[PDB]
Amino acid sequence: EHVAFGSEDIENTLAKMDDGQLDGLAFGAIQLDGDGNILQYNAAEGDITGRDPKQVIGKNFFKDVAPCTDSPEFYGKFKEGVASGNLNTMFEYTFDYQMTPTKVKVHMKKALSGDSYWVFVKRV
Ligand SMILES: *C(=O)/C=C/c1ccc(O)cc1
16 A cells, blocks of 8 residues: 655565555665565565665665765665664765766665665755
8 A cells, every 4th residue: 555754664664565555655665684685676666776686685775875875874774773772873975986976865775575675865
């Protein structure tokens, strides 16, 4: 159905969803493993960044796809959350690698499932 960016139970709703439903979301959604490998990447995220979802699946988000996120403010918070088991943070960021610099809001949250973490993205 509809689900709003930043919803308190977003991870419960998205646990229900297959690839096609994820492509129906109003915001960008990326699912990562604990090493930052890309497990899912939806159509809305591709609309923001110009990346073909089919070609980024399996690549490492912090090393290869999104080097500008390798920073204490983004990757640093991700690794702290993976280690502590409590990842749930929202912040503003700029995506500027091989693209027009684009201001975004990012929400990172642990999934329901084992060894999975979401990055949600919306333009601001
Ligand atoms: C900075 O390098 C960010 C790059 C980026 C962010 C999000 C994406 O889905 C793809 C590339």
